[PDB]
Design a protein around this ligand. Structure first.
Ligand SMILES: *[C@@H]1O[C@H](CO)[C@@H](O[C@@H]2O[C@H](CO)[C@@H](O[C@@H]3O[C@H](CO[C@H]4O[C@H](CO[C@H]5O[C@H](CO)[C@@H](O)[C@H](O)[C@@H]5O)[C@@H](O)[C@H](O[C@H]5O[C@H](CO)[C@@H](O)[C@H](O)[C@@H]5O)[C@@H]4O)[C@@H](O)[C@H](O[C@H]4O[C@H](CO)[C@@H](O)[C@H](O)[C@@H]4O)[C@@H]3O)[C@H](O)[C@H]2NC(C)=O)[C@H](O)[C@H]1NC(C)=O
Ligand SMILES: *[C@@H]1O[C@H](CO)[C@@H](O[C@@H]2O[C@H](CO)[C@@H](O[C@@H]3O[C@H](CO[C@H]4O[C@H](CO[C@H]5O[C@H](CO)[C@@H](O)[C@H](O)[C@@H]5O)[C@@H](O)[C@H](O[C@H]5O[C@H](CO)[C@@H](O)[C@H](O)[C@@H]5O)[C@@H]4O)[C@@H](O)[C@H](O[C@H]4O[C@H](CO)[C@@H](O)[C@H](O)[C@@H]4O)[C@@H]3O)[C@H](O)[C@H]2NC(C)=O)[C@H](O)[C@H]1NC(C)=O
Ligand SMILES: *[C@@H]1O[C@H](CO)[C@@H](O[C@@H]2O[C@H](CO)[C@@H](O[C@@H]3O[C@H](CO[C@H]4O[C@H](CO[C@H]5O[C@H](CO)[C@@H](O)[C@H](O)[C@@H]5O)[C@@H](O)[C@H](O[C@H]5O[C@H](CO)[C@@H](O)[C@H](O)[C@@H]5O)[C@@H]4O)[C@@H](O)[C@H](O[C@H]4O[C@H](CO)[C@@H](O)[C@H](O)[C@@H]4O)[C@@H]3O)[C@H](O)[C@H]2NC(C)=O)[C@H](O)[C@H]1NC(C)=O
Ligand SMILES: *[C@@H]1O[C@H](CO)[C@@H](O[C@@H]2O[C@H](CO)[C@@H](O[C@@H]3O[C@H](CO)[C@@H](O)[C@H](O)[C@@H]3O)[C@H](O)[C@H]2NC(C)=O)[C@H](O)[C@H]1NC(C)=O
Ligand SMILES: *[C@@H]1O[C@H](CO)[C@@H](O[C@@H]2O[C@H](CO)[C@@H](O)[C@H](O)[C@H]2NC(C)=O)[C@H](O)[C@H]1NC(C)=O
Ligand SMILES: *[C@@H]1O[C@H](CO)[C@@H](O)[C@H](O)[C@H]1NC(C)=O
Ligand SMILES: *[C@@H]1O[C@H](CO)[C@@H](O)[C@H](O)[C@H]1NC(C)=O
Ligand SMILES: *[C@@H]1O[C@H](CO)[C@@H](O)[C@H](O)[C@H]1NC(C)=O
Lengths: 102, 115, 101
């Protein structure tokens, strides 16, 4: 019983570490991409005489370039990962340990 | 007894992995689409500032190395790395094991057979 | 019997996390490499347009839209994402031990 709780605990901790790693990775990538968006918009605004180029406005990636896709609405918001199940597993471990009243 | 509690613990872990898979898929796909939009705009810029096309494209050996140099790369501007071949395809996370876990739960419950 | 079935359930979860780790590493590394290529091309553009020399580089730190100052530099390149398999490796070692019982 104790060995099986340990196996569950390993899996649960491995998932936590992966969640942390993915959160760190995505947030690092998101911030880097946002910096590229900002610089690309800054370039566009300073080669203003080249703005014969229109903005796409409503169109997305239907077409599997003729207009700008990136706007000040393109910035990615930080991706905060939901640890709801991991937190419930932590609470379940505390409970599992309590039923031990023998 | 205790068997049912251990199935519940497995179920929590399985569901947590499923949610993380979904979250990572959503994140990657969102990032991919945003990066593809940046590629498109950068290519569109390049095509309209034809007086900047004294700049050559990376002679695939250069390009392969830049994508394989498992570091923060030297890169110091030399030729174009981004082409219409740089677009990222959507990321499809393979819930292979989670789907098999769901099928394993149905089996575990059947193997309670005992009369 | 039920012990062997519970080890199999743990094994499924452990392998599912493994596969996800592999997938995320592949995805992030692919994204990182693509973003690094965009950084390089954007810097290459900046270096070949002397008419944009007026544009300053950002005074880094905190306090971060309105167009002003370069954010991307040769210090912006992302390093490859090393996905540690610490727990998975320990689980693999624990399985070998469980089987010895
Ligand atoms: C991966 O997943 C796990 C699962 O949850 C996640 O969990 C983390 O677990 C670690 C282990 O403890 C947690 O670490 C703690 O973080 C505390 C947060 O403090 C922050 O803010 C501090 C404020 O600054 C002022 O106050 C501090 C004193 O509080 C003072 O020293 C400063 O000078 C300043 O006046 C800041 O200091 C702190 O920075 C760290 O480094 C400095 C450098 O020396 C040190 O002086 C600090 O004390 C601190 O260590 C940080 O930015 C932190 O306070 C805490 O430190 C004390 O308490 C812990 C116990 O709680 C003791 O073990 C430790 O020895 C210290 O006495 C400790 O560092 C972490 O917060 C958990 N995170 C979450 C989300 O729960 C991991 O983080 C995940 N990994 C990821 C995402 O990468
Ligand atoms: C990353 O991206 C995401 C994607 O959008 C982004 O999400 C947005 O987050 C912002 C907040 O940061 C959301 O907007 C805020 O909502 C606050 C909540 O107040 C609400 O209740 C008000 C009460 O009205 C009542 O009566 C009416 C009927 O008469 C009824 O319909 C209402 O439901 C309610 O019962 C309501 O008036 C108010 O309305 C605002 O928001 C709605 C959309 O939710 C919009 O349609 C309205 O036109 C109006 O803007 C709202 O429903 C609100 O207090 C807050 O206000 C800010 O601005 C005012 C000045 O305009 C300041 O005085 C105030 O202090 C706040 O600064 C703001 O509107 C927004 O809706 C989210 N987006 C979506 C799609 O939901 C994240 O934030 C991003 N991350 C960032 C930025 O870090
Ligand atoms: C980094 O990447 C870039 C990206 O491509 C790469 O650029 C290429 O550079 C190579 C040269 O190194 C280019 O190819 C060379 O072009 C030489 C020029 O000769 C031309 O004129 C010939 C005359 O024909 C006339 O009549 C015909 C109609 O009949 C008419 O169309 C012609 O325009 C012209 O009026 C013509 O025959 C010849 O054709 C070759 O090139 C074209 C493409 O330009 C191709 O479509 C043909 O099939 C044919 O290959 C050309 O237009 C040419 O002399 C040279 O030849 C080499 O090979 C022969 C043997 O086949 C050797 O005998 C000779 O000594 C040379 O070694 C070669 O073809 C290539 O076109 C560039 N790419 C592009 C898109 O333009 C850089 O080189 C890369 N950096 C590196 C490799 O370091
Ligand atoms: C991205 O990857 C590069 C590749 O290594 C990381 O660079 C490394 O950063 C460390 C941090 O200082 C350098 O260490 C230094 O070594 C000298 C040598 O004795 C020592 O005197 C210093 O006190 C320090 O220990 C390391 O040399 C350097 N390596 C290279 C090739 O640059 C970089 O930090 C990574 N960036 C990240 C993860 O954000
Ligand atoms: C993956 O994440 C998405 C993002 O919300 C979840 O979306 C929900 O999907 C359920 C399934 O029908 C809907 O009922 C909800 O209304 C959706 N929510 C939103 C905001 O769209 C999705 O369920 C997650 N995958 C899971 C839990 O398996
Ligand atoms: C993957 O993306 C590249 C980039 O353009 C594309 O050429 C290739 O066909 C894509 N693979 C697919 C859609 O299977
Ligand atoms: C990749 O997936 C396989 C499939 O189970 C797994 O055995 C292997 O350890 C994984 N590699 C990782 C997570 O680095
Ligand atoms: C950025 O490029 C310049 C140009 O030579 C170089 O001097 C500088 O050291 C580079 N930044 C690095 C290597 O971090």
């Amino acid at each position: 019983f104790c060995d099986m709780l340990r196996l569950f605990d390993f899996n649960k901790n491995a998932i936590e570490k992966l969640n942390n790693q993915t959160k760190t990775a995505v947030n690092m990538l998101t911030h880097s991409i946002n910096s590229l968006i900002s610089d690309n918009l800054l370039m566009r605004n300073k080669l203003k005489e080249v703005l014969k180029v229109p903005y796409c406005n409503y169109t997305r990636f239907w077409y599997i370039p003729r207009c700008w896709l990136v706007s000040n609405g393109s910035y990615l918001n930080e991706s905060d990962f939901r640890n709801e199940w991991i937190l419930e597993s932590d609470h379940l471990i505390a409970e599992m340990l309590s039923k031990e009243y023998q």
